[PDB]
């Protein structure tokens, strides 16, 4: 079967990472929407303009409300994109045939929207030369973040060419994971986000989201499926553009 | 030897166009700048705030500025990017080791700036399904264009991958020629843009810059030195990365 996916990236990233995943996915035949979130990629805003991650998902709902009754697609998120997937879904569930989570965060519903960001930073820190500002949105102090080069290089893309390596120092901009107004915002709900499929994807080679990380996840909020990539790093649309492309394969012909 | 190049993309495109060719030149040695020009790539400006080529070319003159007396650097430009040559050579010609022209317009001073782009129009009239529009900047119309998918895919594009092509999709922005503000510019300088060394780098299966276009260029100001890469296509940073970075070790061994 086919099916609409629609690639999230993540914090500091834009659409061009999904640069190697869409074309082949559109050989499969299928229809693939990869979008700049909010500050992101070539999005006209900077990061100073945005308020909270509800904000920074602007480019997603809006993309899901230009979808005419009836049509559904499958979202699939890297990194912190499965935060935006979660705003989306308390937004348009009816639209969302399925949830793919790519080495993402999985928030969940009995916890507050800041619950698996707050682990995340336990389990991994150090966030070694990427450097934090300040800014004030909507009468709250926002900490922005780019990251370092050398953070890009080993723990992201550890085994990603030097080519691709590059785009991400050319191409990564300032962004925010809005932790402390996530921490504040109200919870997913079970109606919306907690009544999607949510398939899991990782590998235990991710050198950010760590195995702990993510098999912490996975008890949290039991996904209805769980993909483990063997090899590969972080960004397993770059390094397992095929693998993916299969396993989003799988899901276009399970879930509709 | 080694030097310090400094990559200058074309209208509508960005530094990641450069993404393949950067690492390479760094493997032998060498520094390596990629600049994003006015509201391309990442730079957080509209095509709308610009009202001129010189204007456009802030980042490459703003670089210039910057380098420590007695610091040189060998400028390569590609397309529309041999324009920003010429002005940044008109102000900081003492600064330009040599300017390396990659499948790019080679402007000259004894006719007016536009020139070579007027006589690009006459022998690449058909830009496809490329878009333009119209803005007022500084009490100027400017036509701005917004580069067609199948103008890139066949003419740019020809010889590329899937996965590079998928780039210039997601990443290409709306931009201009400013052509009608190029014939009202005061023409290049003989003393400074006509005193740098110039070196002429070009292949036959250039889809957009045709034979005939390049070969009239060559015979209407004559480089110091001319390379032709056989094969390939316009974006030979692409398609002919190793032969690219072969022929720039050359210029530094050859220009300092």
Same mark, same amino acid.
């Given at each position: 079967?086919?099916?609409?996916?629609?690639? %999230?990236?993540? !914090?500091?990233?834009?659409?061009?990472?999904?640069?190697? =995943?869409?074309?082949? @996915? +559109? /050989? *499969?035949?299928?229809?693939?929407?990869?979008?700049?979130?909010?500050?992101?990629?070539?999005?006209?805003?900077? %990061?100073?303009? !945005?308020?909270?991650?509800?904000?920074?998902?602007?480019? =997603?709902?809006?993309? @899901? +409300? /230009? *979808?005419?009754?009836?049509?559904?697609?499958?979202?699939?998120?890297?990194?912190?994109?499965?935060?935006?997937?979660?705003?989306?879904?308390?937004?348009?569930?009816?639209?969302?045939?399925?949830?793919?989570?790519?080495?993402?965060? *999985?928030?969940?519903?009995?916890?507050?929207?800041?619950?698996?960001?707050?682990?995340?930073?336990?389990?991994?820190?150090?966030?070694?030369?990427?450097?934090?500002?300040?800014?004030?949105?909507?009468?709250?102090?926002?900490?922005? *973040?780019?990251?370092?080069?050398?953070?890009?290089?080993?723990?992201?893309?550890?085994?990603?060419?030097?080519?691709?390596?590059?785009?991400?120092?050319?191409?990564?901009?300032?962004?925010?994971?809005?932790?402390?107004?996530?921490?504040?915002?109200?919870?997913?709900?079970?109606?919306?986000?907690?009544?999607?499929?949510?398939?899991?994807?990782?590998?235990?080679?991710?050198?950010?989201?760590?195995?702990?990380?993510?098999?912490?996840?996975?008890?949290?909020?039991?996904?209805?499926?769980?993909?483990?990539?063997?090899?590969?790093?972080?960004?397993?649309?770059?390094?397992?553009?095929?693998?993916?492309?299969?396993?989003?394969?799988?899901?276009?012909?399970?879930?509709?």
């Amino acid at each position: 079967a086919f099916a609409h996916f629609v690639l %999230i990236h993540t !914090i500091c990233h834009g659409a061009w990472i999904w640069h190697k =995943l869409k074309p082949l @996915l +559109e /050989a *499969l035949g299928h229809k693939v929407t990869a979008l700049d979130l909010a500050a992101s990629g070539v999005d006209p805003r900077q %990061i100073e303009e !945005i308020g909270s991650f509800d904000e920074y998902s602007e480019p =997603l709902l809006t993309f @899901l +409300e /230009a *979808l005419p009754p009836g049509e559904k697609v499958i979202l699939v998120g890297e990194s912190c994109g499965g935060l935006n997937i979660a705003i989306a879904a308390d937004k348009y569930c009816e639209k969302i045939a399925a949830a793919v989570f790519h080495n993402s965060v *999985l928030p969940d519903t009995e916890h507050c929207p800041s619950y698996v960001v707050d682990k995340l930073m336990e389990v991994f820190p150090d966030w070694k030369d990427t450097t934090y500002f300040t800014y004030t949105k909507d009468g709250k102090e926002i900490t922005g *973040l780019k990251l370092g080069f050398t953070l890009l290089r080993e723990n992201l893309y550890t085994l990603c060419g030097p080519e691709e390596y590059e785009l991400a120092k050319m191409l990564t901009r300032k962004g925010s994971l809005f932790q402390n107004i996530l921490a504040k915002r109200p919870f997913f709900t079970k109606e919306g986000y907690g009544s999607i499929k949510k398939i899991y994807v990782w590998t235990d080679q991710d050198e950010i989201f760590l195995p702990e990380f993510q098999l912490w996840q996975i008890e949290n909020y039991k996904p209805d499926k769980v993909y483990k990539v063997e090899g590969g790093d972080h960004l397993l649309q770059l390094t397992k553009t095929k693998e993916i492309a299969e396993i989003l394969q799988e899901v276009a012909d399970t879930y509709n």
